[PDB]
């Protein structure tokens, strides 16, 4: 947006086997990249 | 197509070597990746300023 | 830099993601020529690119 | 107002300390000091007519 790529995050402790947990938690801003590229797709990177 | 410069130190100043740097600045809607230092003042308190 | 480029193969370095201080250049007095076009040499330090 | 080889009868102010007020005139010929270094009344680095 507005000429940047912007990222927000938070990490939280859990104890569950499956599915996204209940409850509220607001993500804080992480980084604000001044990069002008077009984006329309993404893919996850994984460790074997 | 290329010719070498012959720079002897005794050559006349028009034939002596000059170094050049050209700084090209672009102004756009794009984000400002470079800016000047905007040198700060001291900070003072409890006064209308 | 110790060695400059040959002018037929003029080097370009991108300057970005940094804070400048063009006053250190302009007040150096080491330079025989310091010409700016469209931008004033003095106000250059008060500006972003 | 033009002639072969170029007419130089007409001059204009290329450097000034500040912008002119409405209908102001400035006929001063003092060498403009663009930098921190004093001009001592002669042209030089950052010192131009």
Swiss-Prot record, chain C:
Changing residue 30 to P: In strain: Omicron/BA.1, Omicron/BA.2, Omicron/BA.2.12.1, Omicron/BA.2.75, Omicron/BA.4, Omicron/BA.5, Omicron/BQ.1.1, Omicron/XBB.1.5, Omicron/EG.5.1. Changing residue 3 to T: In strain: Omicron/BQ.1.1, Omicron/XBB.1.5, Omicron/EG.5.1. Binds to host ACE2. RBD also interacts with the N-linked glycan on 'Asn-90' of ACE2. Cleavage of S generates a polybasic C-terminal sequence on S1 that binds to host Neuropilin-1 (NRP1) and Neuropilin-2 (NRP2) receptors. Interacts with host integrin alpha-5/beta-1 (ITGA5:ITGB1) and with ACE2 in complex with integrin alpha-5/beta-1 (ITGA5:ITGB1). May interact via cytoplasmic c-terminus with M protein. May interact (via N-terminus) with host bilirubin and biliverdin, thereby preventing antibody binding to the SARS-CoV-2 spike NTD via an allosteric mechanism. Attaches the virion to the cell membrane by interacting with host receptor, initiating the infection. The major receptor is host ACE2. When S2/S2' has been cleaved, binding to the receptor triggers direct fusion at the cell membrane. When S2/S2' has not been cleaved, binding to the receptor results in internalization of the virus by endocytosis using host TFRC and GRM2 and leading to fusion of the virion membrane with the host endosomal membrane. Alternatively, may use NRP1/NRP2 and integrin as entry receptors. This is Spike protein S1. It comes from Severe acute respiratory syndrome coronavirus 2 (2019-nCoV). The lineage of its organism: Viruses, Riboviria, Orthornavirae, Pisuviricota, Pisoniviricetes. The gene is S. The chain holds residues 344 to 392 of 1273 of the full protein.
């Amino acid at each position: 947006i507005d000429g940047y790529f912007k990222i927000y995050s938070k990490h939280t402790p859990i104890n569950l086997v499956r599915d996204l947990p209940q409850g509220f938690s607001a993500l804080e801003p992480l980084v604000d990249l001044p990069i002008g590229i077009n984006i329309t797709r993404f893919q996850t990177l994984l460790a074997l | 197509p290329l010719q070498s410069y012959g720079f002897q130190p005794t050559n006349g100043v028009g034939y002596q070597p000059y170094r050049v740097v050209v700084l090209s600045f672009e102004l756009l809607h794009a984000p400002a990746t470079v800016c000047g230092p905007k040198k700060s003042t001291n900070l003072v308190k409890n006064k209308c300023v | 830099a110790t060695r400059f480029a040959s002018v037929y193969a003029w080097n370009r370095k991108r300057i970005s993601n940094c804070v400048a201080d063009y006053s250190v250049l302009y007040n150096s007095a080491s330079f025989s020529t310091f010409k700016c076009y469209g931008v004033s040499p003095t106000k250059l330090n008060d500006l972003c690119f | 107002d033009s002639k072969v080889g170029g007419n130089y009868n007409y001059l204009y102010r290329l450097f000034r300390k500040s912008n002119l007020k409405p209908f102001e005139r400035d006929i001063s010929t003092e060498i403009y000091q663009a930098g921190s270094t004093p001009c001592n009344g002669v042209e030089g680095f950052n010192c131009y007519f």
